[model samples]
Target: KVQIINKKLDLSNVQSKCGSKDNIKHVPGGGSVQIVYKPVDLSKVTSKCGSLGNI
Candidate 1:
């Protein structure tokens, strides 16, 4: 399950999907290229949104 607020959200096109400066880049001719993504290094990841108890 998921919950969302009705308030407006902000986004940053700051870094590209692959941690590049540009968010969207195209190929030279008729082909395309992009970097696939993997999850953040779990070793350095933590979450404050703990599990939800009975509501």
Candidate 2:
């Protein structure tokens, strides 16, 4: 069973299907991208969300 604590949710099973080790970059918050340029290093990552362009 799973509980959605936040509105942000991906296709699910991301971590298991393609983790950083495999360089399968997880889809962005609002969009989906199955392909990644290269596998990401989980150890070194930075993320942030900018304000909604101009809403």
Candidate 3:
């Protein structure tokens, strides 16, 4: 589940559906692209589905 609060996008309880490891990049001559992965704290995230618990 996703929530936009106070103009901020919250993905604390979200999960990636795609299993690909490909990194999205721009066309030629475009600005450099970088991807950073961070671990989410499940304790701080509120589960939208009580049955599934925190993602």
Clash list (residue pairs), candidate 3: none
lDDT of 3 at 16: 55
TM-score, prediction 1: 0.17
So what's the TM-score on candidate 2? Answer: 0.16
What is candidate 1's CA lDDT for residue 5?
45
| Clash count list over all predictions | 0, 1, 0
Model 1 over residues 1-55: C-alpha lDDT tens digits?
5554445544334433543354334333323233445556445434445766757
TM-scores of the models, in the given order? 0.17, 0.16, 0.15
Q: Model 2 misses residue 22 by how many Å?
A: 28
Residue 55 lDDT, candidate 3, scale 0-100: 70
Cα error, residue 38 of model 3, in Å, equals: 0.2
For all candidates in order, the CA lDDT equals 0.43, 0.48, 0.43
lDDT computed for candidate 1: 0.43
The positional error of residue 21 in candidate 3, measured at the CA in angstroms, is 38
lDDT ranking, high to low = 2, 1, 3
